[PDB]
PDB file of C-alpha atoms in Angstrom:
ATOM      1  CA  UNK A 184     -30.929   0.436 -13.374  1.00 46.19           C
ATOM      2  CA  UNK A 185     -27.994   2.553 -13.753  1.00 47.05           C
ATOM      3  CA  UNK A 186     -28.360   3.650 -10.115  1.00 45.35           C
ATOM      4  CA  UNK A 187     -24.945   5.298  -9.202  1.00 45.16           C
ATOM      5  CA  UNK A 188     -24.274   4.804  -5.384  1.00 47.38           C
ATOM      6  CA  UNK A 189     -21.395   5.676  -3.120  1.00 48.20           C
ATOM      7  CA  UNK A 190     -20.090   3.582  -0.307  1.00 47.87           C
ATOM      8  CA  UNK A 191     -18.374   5.678   2.331  1.00 50.50           C
ATOM      9  CA  UNK A 192     -17.759   5.262   6.039  1.00 52.99           C
ATOM     10  CA  UNK A 193     -20.608   5.249   8.740  1.00 54.35           C
ATOM     11  CA  UNK A 194     -20.530   8.804  10.094  1.00 53.75           C
ATOM     12  CA  UNK A 195     -20.157   6.638  13.343  1.00 52.46           C
ATOM     13  CA  UNK A 196     -16.822   5.026  12.232  1.00 51.12           C
ATOM     14  CA  UNK A 197     -14.400   7.641  12.887  1.00 51.33           C
ATOM     15  CA  UNK A 198     -11.451   5.774  13.396  1.00 50.35           C
ATOM     16  CA  UNK A 199      -9.375   3.480  11.005  1.00 49.94           C
ATOM     17  CA  UNK A 200      -6.834   1.098  11.964  1.00 51.22           C
ATOM     18  CA  UNK A 201      -3.504   0.939  10.671  1.00 47.13           C
ATOM     19  CA  UNK A 202      -1.845  -2.060   9.261  1.00 43.62           C
ATOM     20  CA  UNK A 203       1.452  -3.174   7.804  1.00 44.64           C
ATOM     21  CA  UNK A 204       1.293  -4.590   4.051  1.00 42.13           C
ATOM     22  CA  UNK A 205       1.362  -8.050   5.776  1.00 42.80           C
ATOM     23  CA  UNK A 206      -1.799  -7.360   7.940  1.00 42.95           C
ATOM     24  CA  UNK A 207       0.299  -9.141  10.566  1.00 42.33           C
ATOM     25  CA  UNK A 208      -0.470  -6.559  13.028  1.00 44.96           C
ATOM     26  CA  UNK A 209      -2.960  -3.599  13.703  1.00 47.90           C
ATOM     27  CA  UNK A 210      -2.575  -0.155  15.518  1.00 49.46           C
ATOM     28  CA  UNK A 211      -5.062   2.264  17.019  1.00 51.82           C
ATOM     29  CA  UNK A 212      -2.602   3.645  19.761  1.00 51.28           C
ATOM     30  CA  UNK A 213      -1.911   6.887  17.814  1.00 48.70           C
ATOM     31  CA  UNK A 214      -5.020   7.509  15.800  1.00 48.86           C
ATOM     32  CA  UNK A 215      -7.676  10.130  16.389  1.00 50.07           C
ATOM     33  CA  UNK A 216     -10.622  11.790  14.634  1.00 48.00           C
ATOM     34  CA  UNK A 217     -10.381  15.495  14.079  1.00 50.51           C
ATOM     35  CA  UNK A 218     -13.430  16.105  11.617  1.00 49.56           C
ATOM     36  CA  UNK A 219     -13.131  15.724   8.785  1.00 47.61           C
ATOM     37  CA  UNK A 220      -9.460  14.193   8.415  1.00 45.75           C
ATOM     38  CA  UNK A 221      -8.541  11.068  10.241  1.00 47.66           C
ATOM     39  CA  UNK A 222      -5.225  11.417  11.859  1.00 48.56           C
ATOM     40  CA  UNK A 223      -2.532   8.863  12.611  1.00 49.42           C
ATOM     41  CA  UNK A 224       0.389  10.691  14.414  1.00 50.65           C
ATOM     42  CA  UNK A 225       3.490   8.888  14.877  1.00 50.70           C
ATOM     43  CA  UNK A 226       4.658  10.168  18.221  1.00 47.68           C
ATOM     44  CA  UNK A 227       1.604   8.171  19.874  1.00 49.13           C
ATOM     45  CA  UNK A 228       2.715   4.926  18.147  1.00 49.70           C
ATOM     46  CA  UNK A 229       6.543   5.033  18.671  1.00 47.64           C
ATOM     47  CA  UNK A 230       6.496   1.505  20.358  1.00 48.35           C
ATOM     48  CA  UNK A 231       5.012   0.358  16.893  1.00 49.33           C
ATOM     49  CA  UNK A 232       6.997   2.226  14.480  1.00 51.64           C
ATOM     50  CA  UNK A 233       9.157  -0.413  13.155  1.00 51.07           C
ATOM     51  CA  UNK A 234       6.159  -2.318  11.560  1.00 48.36           C
ATOM     52  CA  UNK A 235       6.101   0.483   8.826  1.00 48.18           C
ATOM     53  CA  UNK A 236       5.123   1.346   6.227  1.00 49.66           C
ATOM     54  CA  UNK A 237       1.565   1.630   7.448  1.00 52.10           C
ATOM     55  CA  UNK A 238      -1.783   1.317   5.518  1.00 52.52           C
ATOM     56  CA  UNK A 239      -5.346   2.227   6.294  1.00 52.52           C
ATOM     57  CA  UNK A 240      -7.592  -0.766   6.479  1.00 52.20           C
ATOM     58  CA  UNK A 241     -11.017   0.434   4.999  1.00 49.02           C
ATOM     59  CA  UNK A 242     -13.976  -1.180   6.953  1.00 50.00           C
ATOM     60  CA  UNK A 243     -15.775  -4.052   6.116  1.00 44.92           C
ATOM     61  CA  UNK A 244     -18.714  -2.358   4.052  1.00 42.65           C
ATOM     62  CA  UNK A 245     -15.866  -2.090   1.264  1.00 42.19           C
ATOM     63  CA  UNK A 246     -15.155  -5.595   1.317  1.00 43.34           C
ATOM     64  CA  UNK A 247     -17.131  -8.382   0.098  1.00 40.14           C
ATOM     65  CA  UNK A 248     -19.340  -9.132  -3.190  1.00 38.19           C
ATOM     66  CA  UNK A 249     -18.275  -5.920  -4.812  1.00 37.95           C
ATOM     67  CA  UNK A 250     -18.684  -6.868  -8.350  1.00 38.86           C
ATOM     68  CA  UNK A 251     -20.664  -3.589  -9.133  1.00 40.59           C
ATOM     69  CA  UNK A 252     -17.817  -1.370  -8.147  1.00 36.76           C
ATOM     70  CA  UNK A 253     -16.012  -2.089 -11.439  1.00 39.07           C
ATOM     71  CA  UNK A 254     -17.662   1.147 -12.786  1.00 36.50           C
ATOM     72  CA  UNK A 255     -15.058   3.188 -11.316  1.00 38.96           C
ATOM     73  CA  UNK A 256     -13.717   5.744  -8.927  1.00 38.33           C
ATOM     74  CA  UNK A 257     -12.235   4.856  -5.481  1.00 36.58           C
ATOM     75  CA  UNK A 258     -11.749   8.340  -4.077  1.00 31.96           C
ATOM     76  CA  UNK A 259      -9.956   9.768  -0.949  1.00 29.58           C
ATOM     77  CA  UNK A 260      -7.893  12.541   0.028  1.00 27.25           C
ATOM     78  CA  UNK A 261      -4.320  12.272   1.642  1.00 27.45           C
ATOM     79  CA  UNK A 262      -2.357  14.851   3.833  1.00 29.16           C
ATOM     80  CA  UNK A 263       1.032  14.413   5.664  1.00 29.99           C
ATOM     81  CA  UNK A 264       4.064  15.761   7.101  1.00 30.88           C
ATOM     82  CA  UNK A 265       7.728  14.267   7.171  1.00 28.98           C
ATOM     83  CA  UNK A 266      11.173  15.578   7.359  1.00 30.08           C
ATOM     84  CA  UNK A 267      12.019  15.322   3.665  1.00 31.27           C
ATOM     85  CA  UNK A 268       9.964  13.927   0.815  1.00 28.49           C
ATOM     86  CA  UNK A 269      11.261  10.710  -0.740  1.00 32.54           C
ATOM     87  CA  UNK A 270       8.279   2.595  -4.543  1.00 29.33           C
ATOM     88  CA  UNK A 271       5.470   1.478  -2.124  1.00 30.78           C
ATOM     89  CA  UNK A 272       2.095   0.790  -3.450  1.00 31.36           C
ATOM     90  CA  UNK A 273      -0.343   3.656  -3.130  1.00 32.71           C
ATOM     91  CA  UNK A 274      -3.221   1.014  -2.690  1.00 30.12           C
ATOM     92  CA  UNK A 275      -3.641  -2.561  -2.396  1.00 30.20           C
ATOM     93  CA  UNK A 276      -6.462  -4.787  -2.959  1.00 28.60           C
ATOM     94  CA  UNK A 277      -6.879  -8.620  -2.092  1.00 30.12           C
ATOM     95  CA  UNK A 278      -9.772 -10.623  -3.005  1.00 28.90           C
ATOM     96  CA  UNK A 279     -11.209 -13.900  -4.713  1.00 28.59           C
ATOM     97  CA  UNK A 280     -12.283 -17.388  -4.278  1.00 26.56           C
ATOM     98  CA  UNK A 281      -9.541 -19.464  -2.852  1.00 30.02           C
ATOM     99  CA  UNK A 282      -8.575 -20.816  -6.331  1.00 30.05           C
ATOM    100  CA  UNK A 283      -8.118 -17.209  -7.718  1.00 27.20           C
ATOM    101  CA  UNK A 284      -7.525 -14.971  -4.398  1.00 22.98           C
ATOM    102  CA  UNK A 285      -4.840 -12.806  -5.484  1.00 22.25           C
ATOM    103  CA  UNK A 286      -3.448  -9.482  -4.526  1.00 21.05           C
ATOM    104  CA  UNK A 287      -3.182  -6.395  -6.672  1.00 18.99           C
ATOM    105  CA  UNK A 288      -1.661  -3.192  -6.153  1.00 20.18           C
ATOM    106  CA  UNK A 289      -1.967   0.738  -7.524  1.00 21.25           C
ATOM    107  CA  UNK A 290       1.015   2.664  -7.768  1.00 19.21           C
ATOM    108  CA  UNK A 291       0.883   6.697  -7.980  1.00 16.36           C
ATOM    109  CA  UNK A 292       2.993   9.513  -7.607  1.00 14.67           C
ATOM    110  CA  UNK A 293       3.931  10.236  -4.005  1.00 15.11           C
ATOM    111  CA  UNK A 294       1.662  12.925  -2.757  1.00 13.70           C
ATOM    112  CA  UNK A 295       3.477  16.323  -1.958  1.00 10.33           C
ATOM    113  CA  UNK A 296       4.443  17.147   1.724  1.00 11.62           C
ATOM    114  CA  UNK A 297       2.176  19.720   3.420  1.00 12.17           C
ATOM    115  CA  UNK A 298      -0.257  19.603   0.638  1.00 12.83           C
ATOM    116  CA  UNK A 299      -3.609  17.639   0.894  1.00 11.07           C
ATOM    117  CA  UNK A 300      -3.705  15.876  -2.040  1.00 10.00           C
ATOM    118  CA  UNK A 301      -6.643  14.060  -3.803  1.00 10.99           C
ATOM    119  CA  UNK A 302      -6.770  10.721  -5.501  1.00  5.31           C
ATOM    120  CA  UNK A 303      -9.473   9.008  -7.595  1.00  5.53           C
ATOM    121  CA  UNK A 304      -8.537   5.605  -8.694  1.00  4.56           C
ATOM    122  CA  UNK A 305     -10.457   4.174 -11.513  1.00  3.15           C
ATOM    123  CA  UNK A 306     -11.835   0.530 -10.389  1.00  2.00           C
ATOM    124  CA  UNK A 307     -10.660  -1.368 -13.684  1.00  3.10           C
ATOM    125  CA  UNK A 308      -7.765  -3.656 -14.645  1.00  4.46           C
ATOM    126  CA  UNK A 309      -6.203  -1.616 -16.993  1.00  4.99           C
ATOM    127  CA  UNK A 310      -4.199   0.332 -14.685  1.00  4.47           C
ATOM    128  CA  UNK A 311      -3.667  -1.859 -11.815  1.00  5.44           C
ATOM    129  CA  UNK A 312      -0.669  -4.285 -11.510  1.00  2.78           C
ATOM    130  CA  UNK A 313       0.152  -7.506  -9.581  1.00  2.00           C
ATOM    131  CA  UNK A 314       1.699  -7.567  -6.174  1.00  2.00           C
ATOM    132  CA  UNK A 315       5.095  -8.671  -6.223  1.00  2.00           C
ATOM    133  CA  UNK A 316       5.899  -7.246  -9.711  1.00  2.00           C
ATOM    134  CA  UNK A 317       8.491  -4.219  -9.477  1.00  2.00           C
ATOM    135  CA  UNK A 318       6.315  -1.154 -10.515  1.00  2.00           C
ATOM    136  CA  UNK A 319       8.451  -0.761 -13.819  1.00  2.00           C
ATOM    137  CA  UNK A 320       7.044  -3.735 -15.137  1.00  2.00           C
ATOM    138  CA  UNK A 321       4.494  -3.042 -18.183  1.00  2.00           C
ATOM    139  CA  UNK A 322       2.024  -5.909 -17.204  1.00  2.00           C
ATOM    140  CA  UNK A 323      -1.032  -4.968 -15.831  1.00  2.00           C
ATOM    141  CA  UNK A 324      -3.932  -6.946 -14.307  1.00  2.00           C
ATOM    142  CA  UNK A 325      -5.978  -9.057 -16.553  1.00  2.00           C
ATOM    143  CA  UNK A 326      -9.821  -8.235 -16.690  1.00  2.00           C
ATOM    144  CA  UNK A 327     -10.438 -11.476 -15.878  1.00  2.00           C
ATOM    145  CA  UNK A 328      -8.438 -11.664 -12.554  1.00  2.00           C
ATOM    146  CA  UNK A 329      -9.592  -8.413 -11.634  1.00  2.00           C
ATOM    147  CA  UNK A 330     -13.059  -9.215 -11.699  1.00  2.00           C
ATOM    148  CA  UNK A 331     -12.466 -12.312  -9.793  1.00  2.00           C
ATOM    149  CA  UNK A 332     -11.045 -10.030  -7.020  1.00  2.00           C
ATOM    150  CA  UNK A 333     -13.945  -7.758  -7.021  1.00  2.00           C
ATOM    151  CA  UNK A 334     -16.219 -10.952  -6.830  1.00  2.00           C
ATOM    152  CA  UNK A 335     -15.300 -10.921  -3.099  1.00  2.00           C
ATOM    153  CA  UNK A 336     -13.120  -8.416  -1.754  1.00  2.00           C
ATOM    154  CA  UNK A 337     -11.013  -9.442   1.026  1.00  2.00           C
ATOM    155  CA  UNK A 338      -9.645  -6.110   1.922  1.00  2.00           C
ATOM    156  CA  UNK A 339      -8.686  -2.523   0.542  1.00  2.00           C
ATOM    157  CA  UNK A 340      -5.633  -0.738   1.942  1.00  2.00           C
ATOM    158  CA  UNK A 341      -4.515   2.788   1.482  1.00  2.00           C
ATOM    159  CA  UNK A 342      -0.755   3.900   2.141  1.00  2.00           C
ATOM    160  CA  UNK A 343      -0.537   5.580   5.503  1.00  2.00           C
ATOM    161  CA  UNK A 344       3.436   6.123   5.499  1.00  2.00           C
ATOM    162  CA  UNK A 345       4.924   8.629   3.177  1.00  2.00           C
ATOM    163  CA  UNK A 346       8.322  10.510   3.005  1.00  2.00           C
ATOM    164  CA  UNK A 347      11.199  10.071   4.949  1.00  2.00           C
ATOM    165  CA  UNK A 348      10.635  10.067   8.834  1.00  2.00           C
ATOM    166  CA  UNK A 349       7.031  10.945   8.872  1.00  2.00           C
ATOM    167  CA  UNK A 350       5.414  13.052  11.401  1.00  2.00           C
ATOM    168  CA  UNK A 351       1.575  12.617  10.925  1.00  2.00           C
ATOM    169  CA  UNK A 352      -0.665  11.503   8.137  1.00  2.00           C
ATOM    170  CA  UNK A 353      -4.334  12.376   7.347  1.00  2.00           C
ATOM    171  CA  UNK A 354      -6.996  10.841   5.124  1.00  2.00           C
ATOM    172  CA  UNK A 355     -10.638  11.984   4.339  1.00  2.00           C
ATOM    173  CA  UNK A 356     -13.329  11.917   1.953  1.00  2.00           C
ATOM    174  CA  UNK A 357     -13.344   8.397   1.553  1.00  2.00           C
ATOM    175  CA  UNK A 358     -15.881   6.851  -1.019  1.00  2.00           C
ATOM    176  CA  UNK A 359     -16.215   4.275  -3.714  1.00  2.00           C
ATOM    177  CA  UNK A 360     -18.647   3.963  -6.674  1.00  2.00           C
ATOM    178  CA  UNK A 361     -21.013   1.104  -7.091  1.00  2.00           C
ATOM    179  CA  UNK A 362     -24.277   0.307  -8.749  1.00  2.00           C
ATOM    180  CA  UNK A 363     -27.851  -0.666  -8.036  1.00  2.00           C
ATOM    181  CA  UNK A 364     -30.835  -1.552 -10.313  1.00  2.00           C
TER     182      UNK A 364
END
């Protein structure tokens, strides 16, 4: 076909949970919609603030048989405020048939404080790395592994916690390219 589509959030889904890297817990207590940005404010989550760093767990429509995504472009905009401005992975994906379930990460430059910054992440092996490998290692994910993750995505996470002592964090414009025929 060559029918370029984008998965995005349902207009109705106006809230996006926070999670630790572990996905051991989830928080909503401090998250609110303020069109278009979706906002997590720390002061409404003080009870939970040790479980940091936090990631946004994208909703199920990004998960699953997503082989067609391999074209490219995971897109989203990020904004945040913290006391000062300075390792942790920008985005995190897990997926696979049990025999090949594995976790990979994408590292990027920390976004600036106060400046809404945009990310577009190419959905291909060449730039991702392996969870558990220090970011300074020059190994990247094999095409083969990558594709086996896409074959069934378990979850995609995007960094919510930034700088030092963070006040609030906003994410918007969330989309990922797929394909139809």
